[PDB]
Symmetry: C3
Subunit: 328 residues, 3 copies
């Protein structure tokens, strides 16, 4: 039936943000981001629905819509306009942009995939980055209709007291850093997202955990204030980068594992850089470090046979990737 | 004769900003932008002349110079350095940059057309965007020689009173929005530009009008202050985008018409975004939304046979485009 | 022996910033940038060593490592994090970023060279630009560990008194402008760099000198404060651009010489633009004008047989380039 098929597609899109396609994973992600905030859940689901509908009415590929490729850029757009909204919870007018902006996610996801299909790169999260970045710039904090939260560049040195670092909270920055991948800051939401990852592929779960760890460690190395680390804002780019490079696209080996750790570190440092830069505009580093770091590590060409990049046409969860590559 | 041929080329370049090649259209555009301000007219004509001369002395293609492709990026550069000049009218020293910057328009119009000819995209207005953006950044408002007008990021919520919206002025935002492509804010100038468009191809005129309408409507939807709408600053990117997508490059159908309306809306929202972003640097959104939106809609690939993208080698006014496509 | 071969590679990398491969040139550059500041010398040498080691352990091409292609992006990264460091000389902890950031130079130098090898363009200094730009954004002036110098956008008109211009200092802006490629402001360092260039190829030395001259002249034309000109900050992009376009990649003719002068002027104006832009973020224009201008002049396509672009696989010092081209 068309309705159940479409809802399967939107569930797969919800799960696809973290490289997993299973529908049960989508249900778990949706449940977690309902646990965090039901308003963000409604906005993100509306974004996914409208993005998939646009991909349908734009005659996009049906084998890519059915895999959630055209819906994972809508859930994030909805969620992150429900996050950066100063108007508070249940500002229903905000759903009107959530539709319109989501409708532009497929177009970008097509256009950039005509610039990137020549080098066989995925359009990781760039539709979301472009769309929500232009939304938050167009509206801004000083807007009558859809004001956004005020992000302001640092104007003084942080007062970091290293004797008060909460190591339990520092460890909990891992689940929340994975939770923050959807913009959710609730450790239960991060744990449910991690269960959703583990159900599909354990390698993705492990790489997300170590990506959060690398992000928090990088934030510690560059003297990031502890509140941002505890909140999980320093990890989600690293989690996604570690998932993407380590196993999903590169076949999983120890050399690819080290490359994924390096990509997580590069994505964390670039996340700090882009947070400090875009804070001048009042913008967040919404998955930009991920796109830049994952693309600069996928474009990497090495004479090492162990670092092998799979064709996008034959990419699946890392275990199936390695089985396919060993079968050749 | 070389002189009359060169003046025909500069007239075609003046007209080509709005996708029209006729020389009579160029004369009408020049007359309109003399009606607005003769100083801007002199600067823009100097820019066109110097850009075409540079394209001649750089051994550029003579079938593209003769079509005004190397002159439409000089008229805008001259006009928009005569617009963003705090020194006032008839500051003759300003002509010295107007030459130099214009001389860099062909080079970009070649260089970018080596990066874009692989995907068969036109270098829409990027020479102008890069050149005048680096000019206004290099000089800035605080410069002894060629100071520019002060564009400053918003620091408080607008005091918009919706009972005082002047619907006649809101409608007049369409002709002035069309005339603002060249920087002119005079409704008579916009009307003359619209006559110039209509003489060549009625579809371009209709798409420019509905592009201005979409720009003003988008500005209303995102609570843009009414002065900017009345001035026509919220439409010109939308007008150009609607001209480009709807008929000029995509063959004209109802699906392409809807896509052109969507591109106008996307260009308006991206224009607000880029105005809010570049205002930090003190820069205007000088045709950047057009380039980004038109390129992201031309790169769009759909399985719909009605949305057909013509090769650039066989692109002309939309009526001839459709006749050629139906003849196949 | 591996040790002497590796040190030869790092010397060639040190020299390769200015397009010269000789090891004696590398020794002279290192001596000059020890004369300027030994701390910057230590940081830059550490950057070169770590970048070459990373290129070795990433299975990069050994015919490119042996030519210093993977080391010239590390010397600059080390030098320019030792320059933009508010902590003062001999802050040994700064060596820890100098390693990590340098290790990311090869990856970019590979990734961008997969995007640019399709148009046969070199990755000029983009690894350095991206890496140090994200370092200086991530840390910034307000950082507890590795604070950077405060670059702040202009907030008032300069008080330039044209009767006090020191023409001897204005001329000395040429050697110091050449020496500022590596960050050194000492005229003796610039002279030693110029000797190092002249030993390898006189055309590179001449083009560097006239590039500094074009940079200082452009700075004079756009009313740049005299302190920046004397310091040599307005020339190094122009010197490098004149070296690259005039002889190194384009075969050396009078038309290519004029094109190199034009590229130096464009790089100087773009350097002012990018200094004014990136100063909002607190960032310097660290070789960005060079990459943008050299790439937009290499992508230039002309019907002039004298303006000929050599394949990167057969590029050497300009004299050998012309001999090869005449031999055909």
């Amino acid at each position: 039936s068309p309705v159940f098929q479409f809802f399967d597609w939107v569930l797969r899109g919800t799960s696809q943000v973290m490289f997993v396609n299973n529908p049960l994973s989508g249900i778990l992600i949706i449940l977690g981001l309902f646990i965090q905030n039901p308003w963000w859940a409604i906005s993100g689901c509306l974004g996914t629905i409208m993005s998939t509908l646009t991909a349908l009415i734009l005659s996009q590929d049906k084998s890519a819509i059915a895999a959630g490729f055209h819906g994972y850029n809508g859930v994030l757009v909805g969620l992150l306009m429900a996050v950066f909204s100063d108007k508070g919870d249940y500002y229903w007018w905000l759903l009107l942009p959530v539709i319109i902006m989501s409708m532009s996610c497929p177009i970008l996801s097509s256009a950039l995939g005509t610039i990137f299909s020549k080098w066989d790169l995925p359009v990781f999260t760039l539709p979301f980055n472009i769309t929500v970045t232009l939304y938050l710039a167009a509206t801004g904090h000083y807007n009558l209709f859809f004001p956004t939260t005020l992000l302001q560049p640092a104007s003084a040195m942080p007062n970091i007291t290293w004797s008060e670092v909460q190591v339990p909270l520092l460890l909990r920055a891992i689940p929340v850093g994975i939770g923050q991948v959807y913009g959710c800051d609730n450790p239960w939401t991060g744990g449910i997202f991690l269960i959703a990852l583990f159900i599909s592929s354990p390698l993705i779960c492990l790489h997300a955990a170590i990506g959060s760890t690398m992000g928090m460690l990088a934030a510690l190395t560059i003297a990031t204030p502890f509140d941002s680390i505890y909140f999980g804002l320093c990890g989600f780019n690293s989690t996604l980068a570690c998932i993407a490079i380590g196993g999903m696209f590169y076949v999983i080996t120890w050399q690819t594992h080290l490359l994924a750790i390096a990509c997580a570190l590069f994505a964390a440092y670039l996340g700090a850089a882009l947070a400090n830069m875009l804070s001048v505009f009042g913008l967040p580093p919404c998955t930009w470090p991920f796109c830049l770091s994952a693309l600069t590590f996928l474009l990497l060409t090495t004479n090492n046979p162990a670092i092998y990049k799979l064709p996008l046409s034959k990419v699946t969860y890392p275990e199936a990737n390695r089985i396919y590559y060993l079968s050749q």
